[PDB]
């Protein structure tokens, strides 16, 4: 009466501002300021879909 | 109809097999999920009344 089998799944669910969000870290290189890296990450996210 | 909708659509929490007593001879821990709810209108039409 069941289809029990192994699968893959996470053990931690984090939601930010009502939407489910996943965390990501990073650090800029030498010579690049923080705001240039922030707008670079903003453009890299905005190049994706909706 | 209300009893059949409340008995056949209920959240199930089974637990895990790597529980906190943890008798000796155990290396693995897996959380068990059931997903015993309905989300579409086609699945709500197959609720057994009698």
């Amino acid at each position: 009466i069941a289809t029990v089998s192994w699968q893959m799944g996470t053990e931690q669910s984090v939601r930010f501002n009502g939407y489910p969000a996943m965390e990501l870290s990073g650090s800029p290189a030498t010579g690049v300021s923080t705001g240039q890296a922030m707008e670079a990450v903003q453009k890299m996210v905005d190049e994706l879909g909706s | 109809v209300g009893s059949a909708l409340s008995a056949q659509n209920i959240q199930i929490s089974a637990g895990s097999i790597g529980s906190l007593p943890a008798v000796r001879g155990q290396t693995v821990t897996a959380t068990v999920t059931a997903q015993g709810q309905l989300g579409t209108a086609e699945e709500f039409g197959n609720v057994i009344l009698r």
Side-chain angles (χ1 to χ4, degrees):
Chain A
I1 60 178
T3 77
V4 54
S5 75
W6 284 86
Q7 67 163 5
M8 202 67 60
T10 176
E11 293 177 350
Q12 172 170 324
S13 198
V14 180
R15 296 179 71 108
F16 200 86
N17 286 333
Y19 308 99
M22 301 192 81
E23 305 94 29
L24 191 148
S25 198
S27 89
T30 43
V32 194
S33 88
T34 58
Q36 304 298 290
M38 281 197 297
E39 61 87 12
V41 171
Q42 180 69 64
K43 285 194 302 179
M44 284 307 180
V45 167
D46 286 327
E47 273 146 32
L48 289 177
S50 60
Chain B
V1 184
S3 78
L5 280 161
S6 315
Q8 301 186 29
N9 182 83
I10 185 59
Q11 194 73 80
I12 311 178
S13 87
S16 44
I17 55 181
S19 279
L20 267 183
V23 81
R24 313 285 97 91
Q26 184 77 19
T27 53
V28 79
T29 293
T31 318
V32 185
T33 43
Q35 202 50 241
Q37 283 184 320
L38 311 178
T40 57
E42 194 183 5
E43 295 172 354
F44 267 98
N46 300 325
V47 169
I48 311 295
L49 292 186
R50 184 178 62 182

